[PDB]
Design an enzyme around this catalytic site. Structure first.
Site, PDB file in Angstrom:
ATOM      1  N   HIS A  26      60.958  56.701  19.312  1.00 56.15           N
ATOM      2  CA  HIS A  26      61.663  56.226  18.252  1.00 56.15           C
ATOM      3  C   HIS A  26      62.571  55.234  18.259  1.00 56.15           C
ATOM      4  O   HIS A  26      63.425  54.190  17.957  1.00 56.15           O
ATOM      5  CB  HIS A  26      62.655  57.130  18.862  1.00 56.15           C
ATOM      6  CG  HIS A  26      62.529  58.778  18.704  1.00 56.15           C
ATOM      7  ND1 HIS A  26      62.279  59.122  17.300  1.00 56.15           N
ATOM      8  CD2 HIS A  26      62.033  59.633  19.675  1.00 56.15           C
ATOM      9  CE1 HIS A  26      62.004  60.288  17.613  1.00 56.15           C
ATOM     10  NE2 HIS A  26      61.832  60.893  18.747  1.00 56.15           N
ATOM     11  N   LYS A  46      53.591  62.960  10.912  1.00 60.26           N
ATOM     12  CA  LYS A  46      54.491  63.925  11.843  1.00 60.26           C
ATOM     13  C   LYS A  46      55.262  63.449  10.575  1.00 60.26           C
ATOM     14  O   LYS A  46      55.627  62.762  10.043  1.00 60.26           O
ATOM     15  CB  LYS A  46      55.025  62.862  12.413  1.00 60.26           C
ATOM     16  CG  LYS A  46      56.023  63.306  13.856  1.00 60.26           C
ATOM     17  CD  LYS A  46      56.405  62.270  15.081  1.00 60.26           C
ATOM     18  CE  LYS A  46      57.588  63.777  15.479  1.00 60.26           C
ATOM     19  NZ  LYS A  46      58.660  62.320  16.368  1.00 60.26           N
ATOM     20  N   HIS A  77      64.731  63.291  24.055  1.00 58.22           N
ATOM     21  CA  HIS A  77      63.841  63.788  22.825  1.00 58.22           C
ATOM     22  C   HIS A  77      64.949  63.518  21.465  1.00 58.22           C
ATOM     23  O   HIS A  77      66.687  63.213  22.301  1.00 58.22           O
ATOM     24  CB  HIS A  77      64.529  65.546  22.591  1.00 58.22           C
ATOM     25  CG  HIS A  77      64.343  66.231  21.313  1.00 58.22           C
ATOM     26  ND1 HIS A  77      62.920  65.918  20.722  1.00 58.22           N
ATOM     27  CD2 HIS A  77      65.415  66.240  20.923  1.00 58.22           C
ATOM     28  CE1 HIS A  77      63.544  66.919  19.860  1.00 58.22           C
ATOM     29  NE2 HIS A  77      64.977  67.677  20.132  1.00 58.22           N
ATOM     30  N   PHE A  78      64.465  63.193  20.386  1.00 55.10           N
ATOM     31  CA  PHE A  78      66.049  62.606  19.817  1.00 55.10           C
ATOM     32  C   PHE A  78      65.555  63.693  18.612  1.00 55.10           C
ATOM     33  O   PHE A  78      65.002  64.862  18.240  1.00 55.10           O
ATOM     34  CB  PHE A  78      65.238  61.546  18.757  1.00 55.10           C
ATOM     35  CG  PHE A  78      66.276  61.237  17.648  1.00 55.10           C
ATOM     36  CD1 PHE A  78      66.555  61.609  16.674  1.00 55.10           C
ATOM     37  CD2 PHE A  78      67.084  60.166  17.685  1.00 55.10           C
ATOM     38  CE1 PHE A  78      67.396  61.054  15.498  1.00 55.10           C
ATOM     39  CE2 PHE A  78      67.651  59.558  16.899  1.00 55.10           C
ATOM     40  CZ  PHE A  78      68.464  59.377  16.166  1.00 55.10           C
ATOM     41  N   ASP A  79      67.669  64.463  18.445  1.00 53.09           N
ATOM     42  CA  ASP A  79      67.908  65.864  18.806  1.00 53.09           C
ATOM     43  C   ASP A  79      68.035  65.570  16.562  1.00 53.09           C
ATOM     44  O   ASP A  79      68.061  66.556  16.153  1.00 53.09           O
ATOM     45  CB  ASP A  79      68.401  67.045  19.024  1.00 53.09           C
ATOM     46  CG  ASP A  79      68.640  67.763  19.032  1.00 53.09           C
ATOM     47  OD1 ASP A  79      68.129  68.814  19.206  1.00 53.09           O
ATOM     48  OD2 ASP A  79      69.456  68.795  18.357  1.00 53.09           O
TER      49      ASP A  79
END
Length: 124
Positions: free
Chosen positions: A12, A41, A119-121
């Protein structure tokens, strides 16, 4: 072997540029960061802010994650981000992505000591 925090960075973080300048940014970057190794991905966001500013989000607005856990945080301000999404035609190993540059709030899940993004939500 990669920690969760290190994997978040690899997937990210893109502080090296202030914004995606071309429509082939996502194709490039998803390949560069090894996000197309085994599979394409499907969705991924790159953030164009300092690591310090992104880690700082873990001290900002506490919200629920999509999964119902309560260790997510939303950035008070917007950030420069690029949204990458696999096109419907894309087939491994020929992964293809639509690039959308935007200024949005980010939402990340935070864990650990130190308490950092893992984590990227979502973006808002």
């Amino acid at each position: 072997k990669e920690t969760a925090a290190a994997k978040f960075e690899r997937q990210h973080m893109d502080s090296s540029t202030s914004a995606a300048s071309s429509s082939n940014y996502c194709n490039q970057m998803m390949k560069s960061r090894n996000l197309t190794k085994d599979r394409c991905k499907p969705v991924n966001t790159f953030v164009h802010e300092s690591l310090a500013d992104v880690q700082a989000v873990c001290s900002q607005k506490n919200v629920a994650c999509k999964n119902g856990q309560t260790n997510c945080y939303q950035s008070y301000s917007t950030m420069s981000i690029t949204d990458c999404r696999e096109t419907g035609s894309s087939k491994y190993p020929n992964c293809a992505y639509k690039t959308t540059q935007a200024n949005k709030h980010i939402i990340v899940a935070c864990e650990g000591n130190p308490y950092v993004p893992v984590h990227f939500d979502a973006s808002v």
